[model samples]
Target: AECSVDIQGNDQMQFNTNAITVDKSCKQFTVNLSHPGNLPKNVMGHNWVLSTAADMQGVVTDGMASGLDKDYLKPDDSRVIAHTKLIGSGEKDSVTFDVSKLKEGEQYMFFDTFPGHSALFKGTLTLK
Candidate 1:
């Protein structure tokens, strides 16, 4: 079967699924993020960021400095593999990249960059 997955993040900073597995056979993978709330990006926004588990804290901290206009992500940060543009309530975004970007033995960390969303909003993407 072709490998593909869909995911959601809402106003609560919670993702519909906490973990996703990318099948080894997939040449590429896609993630679709939808925000169902009505708040604006400044109050309740979200984005999907992909990085190693160990780099989560550092990335989030530095990304904040980059601000929301930049999708709350650092500009051309080499550590990031792929990410979606920031979305607000009622807004949605999607990102796709090569599965080869991820290594089989490594763990991928994903999270929301909205100001305080990092505290409880996060998940992992595992490759098998």
Candidate 2:
């Protein structure tokens, strides 16, 4: 029944939830992310980027090449279905994407692209 969900990223490089379900009829879905880790943005930051399960590695590889100023992502990269800004401890960021872009049979992956964090901090997103 909520329009938005709050997710947490902590010092252990993990997300609080592994599964995220969104109602297909909602006009919009929002993810309010809080970075509770003490490390600075450049050192151990986190950002949420969404893409198809098959497109994840390619998007992330190009994102890494884009560097930190771009939030470790490419410039207006179309492959990124949605994303939040990089944040540090006590900092917060949120992203809202159109529900139309999501399809019922498709699968999406969310990950943090801070150097090596994606290896552990990742999850699947489903639309129902």
Candidate 3:
């Protein structure tokens, strides 16, 4: 089967899905994020970021300081496993990464770093 998933964010600051699984047989996986709201990016921007669960807080903290122009992410920070650029209403972005980057028993998270969006737009990723 194809290894890909579609995610959505809206003006409500929520994601459609809370968990994603990557098939072990896949060498790579793709994540597609779309915004179907009518708001502008500055008013309601969204992004998809992947990192270890343990590192999620720090990433969000640094992202908060980086501002929206940088997509709310620290410059050249290597902790990110994979991420998509910030998008606005009617916009979409995709991110692909090697499945090997994930460990079987490790914990990982995906979230939006748009200020308070992370609190409502976050999920778990698991290897299957």
lDDT of every model, 2 decimals: 0.83, 0.85, 0.92
- Model 1 lDDT tens row, 37-112: 7788888888888899998888898899888788787787888888888888888788889988999999789888
What range of 10 consecutive residues in model 3 has the weakest lDDT sum? Answer: 7-16
Model 1 clash tally? 0
Could you tell me every candidate's TM-score relative to the true structure?
0.93, 0.94, 0.97
The digit string of per-residue lDDT tens for model 3 on 29-56 reads 9999999989988889999999999999
Candidate 2 structure quality by residue, lDDT tens digits, 1-128: 65577888887787788778888887788999898878888887888888989989988888889899988887877888888898888899999878898998898998888788889888899888
Q: Candidate 2, clashing residue pairs?
A: none
Q: What is the lDDT of residue 63 in candidate 2?
A: 81
Off by over 4 Å in 1: none
Which candidate comes out best when scored by TM-score? 3
Give the clash count for model 3. Answer: 0
Candidate 1 global lDDT: 0.83
